[PDB]
Amino acid sequence: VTAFLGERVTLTSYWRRVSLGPEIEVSWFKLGPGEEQVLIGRMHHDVIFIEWPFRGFFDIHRSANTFFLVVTAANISHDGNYLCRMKLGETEVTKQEHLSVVKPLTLSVHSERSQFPDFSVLTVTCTVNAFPHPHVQWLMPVMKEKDGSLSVAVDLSLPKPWHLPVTCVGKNDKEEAHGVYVSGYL
Amino acid sequence: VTAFLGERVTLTSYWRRVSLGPEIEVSWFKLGPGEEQVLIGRMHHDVIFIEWPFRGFFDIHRSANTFFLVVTAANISHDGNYLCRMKLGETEVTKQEHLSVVKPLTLSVHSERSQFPDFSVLTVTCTVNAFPHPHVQWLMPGGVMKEKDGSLSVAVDLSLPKPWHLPVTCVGKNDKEEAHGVYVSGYL
Amino acid sequence: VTAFLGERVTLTSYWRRVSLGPEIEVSWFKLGPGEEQVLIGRMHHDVIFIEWPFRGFFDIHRSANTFFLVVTAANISHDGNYLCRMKLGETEVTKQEHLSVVKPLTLSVHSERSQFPDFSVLTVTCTVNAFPHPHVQWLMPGGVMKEKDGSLSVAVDLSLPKPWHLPVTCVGKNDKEEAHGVYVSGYL
Amino acid sequence: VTAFLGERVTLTSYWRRVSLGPEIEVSWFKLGPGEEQVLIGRMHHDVIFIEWPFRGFFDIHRSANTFFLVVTAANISHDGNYLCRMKLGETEVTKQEHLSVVKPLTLSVHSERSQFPDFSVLTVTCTVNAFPHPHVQWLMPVMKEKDGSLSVAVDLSLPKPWHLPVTCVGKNDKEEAHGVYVSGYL
Amino acid sequence: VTAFLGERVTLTSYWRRVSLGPEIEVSWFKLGPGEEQVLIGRMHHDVIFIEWPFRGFFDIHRSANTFFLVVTAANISHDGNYLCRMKLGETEVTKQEHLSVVKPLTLSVHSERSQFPDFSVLTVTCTVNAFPHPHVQWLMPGGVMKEKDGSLSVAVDLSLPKPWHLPVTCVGKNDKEEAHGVYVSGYL
Amino acid sequence: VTAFLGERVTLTSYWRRVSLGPEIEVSWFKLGPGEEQVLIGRMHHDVIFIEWPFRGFFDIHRSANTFFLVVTAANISHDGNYLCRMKLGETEVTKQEHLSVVKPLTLSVHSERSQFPDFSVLTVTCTVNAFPHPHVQWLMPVMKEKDGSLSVAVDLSLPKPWHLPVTCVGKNDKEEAHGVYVSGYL
Numbered sequence A, D, F: 001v002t003a004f005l006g007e008r009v010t011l012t013s014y015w016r017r018v019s020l021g022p023e024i025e026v027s028w029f030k031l032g033p034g035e036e037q038v039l040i041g042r043m044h045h046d047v048i049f050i051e052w053p054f055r056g057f058f059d060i061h062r063s064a065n066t067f068f069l070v071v072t073a074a075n076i077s078h079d080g081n082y083l084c085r086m087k088l089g090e091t092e093v094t095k096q097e098h099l100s101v102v103k104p105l106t107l108s109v110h111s112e113r114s115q116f117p118d119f120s121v122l123t124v125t126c127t128v129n130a131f132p133h134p135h136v137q138w139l140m141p142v143m144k145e146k147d148g149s150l151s152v153a154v155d156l157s158l159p160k161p162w163h164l165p166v167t168c169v170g171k172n173d174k175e176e177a178h179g180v181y182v183s184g185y186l
Numbered sequence B, C, E: 001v002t003a004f005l006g007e008r009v010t011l012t013s014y015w016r017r018v019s020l021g022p023e024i025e026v027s028w029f030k031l032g033p034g035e036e037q038v039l040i041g042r043m044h045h046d047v048i049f050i051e052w053p054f055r056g057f058f059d060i061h062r063s064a065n066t067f068f069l070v071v072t073a074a075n076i077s078h079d080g081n082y083l084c085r086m087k088l089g090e091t092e093v094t095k096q097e098h099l100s101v102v103k104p105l106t107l108s109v110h111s112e113r114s115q116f117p118d119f120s121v122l123t124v125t126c127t128v129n130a131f132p133h134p135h136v137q138w139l140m141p142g143g144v145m146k147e148k149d150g151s152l153s154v155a156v157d158l159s160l161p162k163p164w165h166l167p168v169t170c171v172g173k174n175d176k177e178e179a180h181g182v183y184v185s186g187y188l
């Protein structure tokens, strides 16, 4: 499933076949490296307990034979693989679900003339912030953010006479924006 | 003169025809609201004193008969008029110089999709920060915020229901300065 | 329903006789002072939006024809009445549910002896913290403080001159909830 | 001597026999491990100097041939052994005095029902904070505090049907309180 | 009695002719603005209680028939009058004692040269901090500042154009206390 | 050149002979140990760029064939040697200039009687704060400050009867002040 940052989102699991609902002992885990398990919460007979680190971040519920992991507001740490362990008696079945969290890209353009040796060089900067894959490219004719998003910036230095307009292509997988520097202040 | 934000800048002045160099008493004033003349500093006989509030932000020096007010890193408060008063004995001449401080525009584009009743509405946001005159406008195929640095920000939202009227282009300006941002395709 | 402080809690609602599941527009409201209905969130066609002030604190989901408001960790502000509004076309039905939040009582006993004119007077202090209704009372053989968490504290002092009228028993209550604390012997 | 937390308290020493009052050079030390000496203050000819770390915490004075260490407000760091060194000429006599600081016990009772797998288990918690020796015990039919006191807590888990009332016995040497959980909210 | 800032100090009192030691109820009061008597502490039968606001700052003890109020580290707020009230049965006697707290003066000298129009003017600054009575005066060959500690500071500037009228001597006082600071030669 | 703390100050350099003004590429460096170079700024064709650590602290300019380093407000870190590198083509000439920063001295006198064994000893303290060379000396008949200045203090202990007046001599190279303790409070 794909969620955008801040959106409610849901993963689901079910046992089989097996149609036994509230009798199944359900636990959901967030998977780390290399598939290391961190318990989010447990459900049995429609009594649910969320572990304190995930409280308000995740909930669990049942509808018939389907088990739900709900993410109240997706953030970038929530990206990746989850494990639903379903247990009846001394028997057990696990299912893996994937959540893709996507921060829509922000494309910024800004320019700055040189200050030494003279003021004749226009450096145009193009910045893409996004998740998972920001990408930046100039046409002529990197950093980790507090929220876990990634920023990339590229400078184009332009000797006089300035090759204006220049177009910046920002991408986040299939998402794309352009930034066009058209003319200088002077 | 025009200076971009952060740049070393220079205003200049000289007297005439009067080649007297260090004999001339020079004082530089920042002109305020107002009519008010606020002293930056003085130079005479190659002794330069810069008033405490301006220290580090402005300097004064002479090259022969030319007098210089140096702004060490142009900030938006430095935008406005300046006065160089030159004195010899009982006679004075005054020269008025303008400094334009410009922050080059930053244009940003980003989109967000709707979360209720469904996920079908794209809102695309275009933000221009600049000084003195940011302006933004959406093309198809809200206050001024004052930032900490004195520059001004302006933002416009455009909502697109399905089918998204894509290629949308944002036009940003700051006087003659111009940039665009084009939202081409969503992530899906 | 009754929830202790910190517990996951659930209010439920369904329409009738009307087995329409995802076709029904559900909204949940917290009832305020007041007469005021404050929107927690909405569900329709299995798209759930929780208002920003309630995000993380409440969730909404459906199981077939039953609608659930989940409180993720019951706090004392959550105590009160809730409204589930169910809509189909132009017709609505509304269900009012109550949540009672209870903090289980804490009873504390401690004694302190007098320091002047001498060391012979024992004062024994009994403190009950709970929600909604802490109450304390001393048996032989002062404001309500509002805590940060919304719970209420109540304290009673009993002074005993020599010979100390020991076994003293403190009785603490919170509605039907009951605890005692008995001061048996001093340190000497 | 026994002082309770916050009470003024006094230790005393004297030389012998020897009846020579203000002529004796008196110094008091707080004893650490293993009897390590830390100077509190000195007295001679009724001139007294308290070392800055103990200033406002301790004073010293004389009455005739008796030397006094006064503790202005006993705290738990003041618990333990003190040394009075009494010096006349190149001769010297030391006496050891003991201060017991006692924090009267606080007994707390609180209960909490289980949240998973169901809500049927009552865990009753009984906490004793005290100094020197808090102790807790349940009848059916650990941590160090900022002020230097010690807290101990014990949980009794009760399956349904709840074995109510349960009585908690708190002790601090001979000090004793009981905590009785009598009935649940529901 | 006189105590310098930071010193252990003692006021004393006794009754008469009345050799009753521990039988006497003693209380010590700090006298305020005002006419107001503020209780420091009490002693009776060798039980001493010091009021919470004075704890650590003052103590009381007895040696036979003499009663002592000990100030553990004299501060400037301790300067003023004190009352020892001695009681036996229904009869009382009261003794008034004065504590003078003195901060010994600090005298500082420093010079600064002028920066405009030239470097030829020396200003020499002399600062006296003390309690109760700092005073400063320049000899040839402006408020009181209240410091955090209750002491008082006083500063005088003397400008000297070339040729500098050197040996200049600063005279500092605090009642009978006296110090000088002499500026002898500049750095050049 | 000598500057006092807080004063504007100037260093100058020139190439030769060579009379070619704005054609020369000028860079000024602050010298550390052992002559390590830290760039302050560069000038060429009367375009000047000051490096951000020195911005508002230093400026550079030309008057004809003379190159100026200006220090806007001298502080103690600015004390020591500077290097002017002057470059034309692949040829280069460097000149060393020295700035002496001087904090005028502050002489303080204060006295304090003993507190143990009795109150009969007058300790008079004399403190000189200065830069570069504070010095203190008592006549009978060390520390580094936040601003980089140096403080030195000397105590004179005086048994009764007090040898008053005592005179303190403060020096900072040729700068000199005296402090005279003339009489006690009591």
Ligand SMILES: *[C@@H]1O[C@H](CO)[C@@H](O[C@@H]2O[C@H](CO)[C@@H](O[C@@H]3O[C@H](CO)[C@@H](O)[C@H](O)[C@@H]3O)[C@H](O)[C@H]2NC(C)=O)[C@H](O)[C@H]1NC(C)=O
Pocket (backbone or CB within 6 Å): A052, A053, A054, A057, A075, A076, A077, A078, A146, A147, A148
């Ligand atoms: C993204 O979501 C994750 C949860 O899935 C967020 O992490 C959680 O953040 C909370 C709030 O900080 C953590 O609780 C803090 O814990 C420490 C004790 O270790 C304590 O000092 C605080 O009072 C508070 O309880 C919680 O442990 C943590 N959960 C996990 C599983 O890491 C993350 O902060 C979210 N936001 C962003 C922007 O990433």
Ligand SMILES: *[C@@H]1O[C@H](CO)[C@@H](O[C@@H]2O[C@H](CO)[C@@H](O[C@@H]3O[C@H](CO)[C@@H](O)[C@H](O)[C@@H]3O)[C@H](O)[C@H]2NC(C)=O)[C@H](O)[C@H]1NC(C)=O
Pocket (backbone or CB within 6 Å): B052, B053, B054, B057, B075, B076, B077, B078, B148, B149, B150
């Ligand atoms: C833009 O440049 C102006 C200066 O031309 C900057 O203003 C000056 O700012 C400094 C603080 O860095 C002020 O110095 C402070 O003044 C207070 C107020 O009396 C004093 O308490 C402090 O110790 C300190 O000296 C200075 O007076 C002020 N000068 C003016 C306004 O003429 C301004 O900070 C810069 N703005 C930005 C956004 O960088």
Ligand SMILES: *[C@@H]1O[C@H](CO)[C@@H](O[C@@H]2O[C@H](CO)[C@@H](O[C@@H]3O[C@H](CO)[C@@H](O)[C@H](O)[C@@H]3O)[C@H](O)[C@H]2NC(C)=O)[C@H](O)[C@H]1NC(C)=O
Pocket (backbone or CB within 6 Å): C052, C053, C054, C057, C075, C076, C077, C078, C148, C149, C150
């Ligand atoms: C008990 O639960 C209620 C929620 O049902 C908690 O109140 C909510 O508390 C949060 C803060 O954690 C508020 O979010 C903040 O609001 C301010 C004000 O506009 C905003 O500046 C912050 O950025 C942040 O979003 C939220 O609005 C508020 N919701 C309400 C009152 O409906 C409350 O904090 C909990 N109380 C305790 C004692 O835990």
Ligand SMILES: *[C@@H]1O[C@H](CO)[C@@H](O[C@@H]2O[C@H](CO)[C@@H](O[C@@H]3O[C@H](CO)[C@@H](O)[C@H](O)[C@@H]3O)[C@H](O)[C@H]2NC(C)=O)[C@H](O)[C@H]1NC(C)=O
Pocket (backbone or CB within 6 Å): D052, D053, D054, D057, D075, D076, D077, D078, D146, D147, D148
């Ligand atoms: C219990 O009583 C002892 C004294 O018998 C208390 O310790 C003393 O606490 C004072 C106040 O903190 C200490 O003075 C601090 O010293 C540091 C320098 O090391 C400085 O940063 C502060 O301005 C202040 O002077 C004092 O040194 C310390 N004395 C000893 C002998 O340790 C203890 O704090 C008392 N209270 C409790 C609750 O334990």
Ligand SMILES: *[C@@H]1O[C@H](CO)[C@@H](O[C@@H]2O[C@H](CO)[C@@H](O[C@@H]3O[C@H](CO)[C@@H](O)[C@H](O)[C@@H]3O)[C@H](O)[C@H]2NC(C)=O)[C@H](O)[C@H]1NC(C)=O
Pocket (backbone or CB within 6 Å): E052, E053, E054, E057, E075, E076, E077, E078, E148, E149, E150
């Ligand atoms: C000089 O000595 C006097 C005492 O004789 C000092 O005043 C006392 O100062 C303490 C604080 O260290 C006060 O204790 C505090 O009072 C507040 C106010 O109610 C309370 O919130 C705090 O928890 C704390 O107990 C005390 O009441 C006060 N006594 C008085 C004024 O009689 C004073 O601090 C000393 N001054 C200097 C400059 O050292």
Ligand SMILES: *[C@@H]1O[C@H](CO)[C@@H](O[C@@H]2O[C@H](CO)[C@@H](O[C@@H]3O[C@H](CO)[C@@H](O)[C@H](O)[C@@H]3O)[C@H](O)[C@H]2NC(C)=O)[C@H](O)[C@H]1NC(C)=O
Pocket (backbone or CB within 6 Å): F052, F053, F054, F057, F075, F076, F077, F078, F146, F147, F148
């Ligand atoms: C004496 O003058 C020197 C400069 O010649 C002063 O040093 C400079 O001080 C500024 C202001 O702190 C430094 O900029 C700080 O840099 C850090 C990053 O490393 C950043 O956290 C701050 O926002 C700020 O930019 C500057 O780097 C430093 N320059 C040098 C060459 O060291 C010194 O502070 C002056 N004053 C005194 C009393 O010494």
Ligand SMILES: [Pt+2]
Pocket (backbone or CB within 6 Å): A001, A002, A098, A099, A100
């Ligand atoms: Pt996916």
Ligand SMILES: [Pt+2]
Pocket (backbone or CB within 6 Å): A143, A144, A145, A151
């Ligand atoms: Pt970044």
Ligand SMILES: [Pt+2]
Pocket (backbone or CB within 6 Å): B021, B064
């Ligand atoms: Pt010239």
Ligand SMILES: [Pt+2]
Pocket (backbone or CB within 6 Å): B145, B146, B147, B153
């Ligand atoms: Pt803004």
Ligand SMILES: [Pt+2]
Pocket (backbone or CB within 6 Å): C021, C064
């Ligand atoms: Pt369904």
Ligand SMILES: [Pt+2]
Pocket (backbone or CB within 6 Å): C145, C146, C147, C153
């Ligand atoms: Pt309270």
Ligand SMILES: [Pt+2]
Pocket (backbone or CB within 6 Å): D001, D002, D098, D099, D100
């Ligand atoms: Pt003992």
Ligand SMILES: [Pt+2]
Pocket (backbone or CB within 6 Å): D143, D144, D145, D151
């Ligand atoms: Pt604890």
Ligand SMILES: [Pt+2]
Pocket (backbone or CB within 6 Å): E021, E064
């Ligand atoms: Pt006695």
Ligand SMILES: [Pt+2]
Pocket (backbone or CB within 6 Å): E145, E146, E147, E153
């Ligand atoms: Pt002051």
